[PDB]
Amino acid sequence: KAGPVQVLIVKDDHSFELDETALNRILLSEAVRDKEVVAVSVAGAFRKGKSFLMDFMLRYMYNQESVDWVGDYNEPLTGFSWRGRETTGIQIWSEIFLINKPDGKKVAVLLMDTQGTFDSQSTLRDSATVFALSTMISSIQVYNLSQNVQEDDLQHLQLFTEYGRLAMEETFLKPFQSLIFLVRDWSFPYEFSYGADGGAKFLEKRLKVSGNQHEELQNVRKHIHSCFTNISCFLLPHPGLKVATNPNFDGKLKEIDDEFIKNLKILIPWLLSPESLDIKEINGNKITCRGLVEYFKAYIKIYQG
Ligand SMILES: Nc1nc2c(ncn2[C@@H]2O[C@H](COP(=O)(O)OP(=O)(O)O)[C@@H](O)[C@H]2O)c(=O)[nH]1
């Protein structure tokens, strides 16, 4: 019986609590504690499609050797679920996946769900710290945005990446590895196609710095590029009104929009295929499951005092 485990939470006193006992129970088990880890995080605001997406990532991780891992077209969705509260923090999946690479060594896959809002100036520090810790631990950060990538989205991205930099060890190269803009309800396929190719051209125009841009407009883009060695973008279509208006969607897979499943079938392996798995690195050293827990404990202690 696997499920989501609340690892990081923000108490009402605006302090940060890390469930170390739950962290150790998952990542320090003898079967996985000494294995190089890949940490994939889906980060975004509440009610933006994160749990619905990660249930399909689980379907892929539990059925990688199946062609139709998404499920039966005529039957409801099957498998474990994150969709069990608007809690600002980080959740991880209780089961760590051991993936045999094309090589002969087993790699560990950790899945993270990061949640928080940047709406008001009051809840800004709490969500910035949570999203910072998510970016510092994960090897791929999936920025889950809705409809478009707006300027405030980049400002917030600059905010929690700057929080993370101030706590990390100083590095000559870039501090983080992979950032991905996941635009969830893309409604302009006639400008940029659904998927990674359209997202690449879209993000190219968005994060382009030009001399006619405002000073604040270019400087936030210079910062974002300096933080990640790779930055990607995937334009995902709308899943349909049955998914959008149902809390915890339980209908048949047929009732999800066909274009959504088509691009979802290529989004998930684009993220989690064994060939694309890059080991998490901190300060230039490949991190193991045991080491990732140590950095999580070390980073959280810096933000407390
Ligand atoms: N418009 C839209 N709605 C979605 C999408 N994915 C899920 N939903 C629906 O929107 C609501 C989001 O809930 P959920 O994703 O579980 O919450 P979250 O994990 O905190 O973002 C649910 O009712 C879903 O059925 C999406 O890509 N676009």
Ligand SMILES: [Mg+2]
């Ligand atoms: Mg969630």
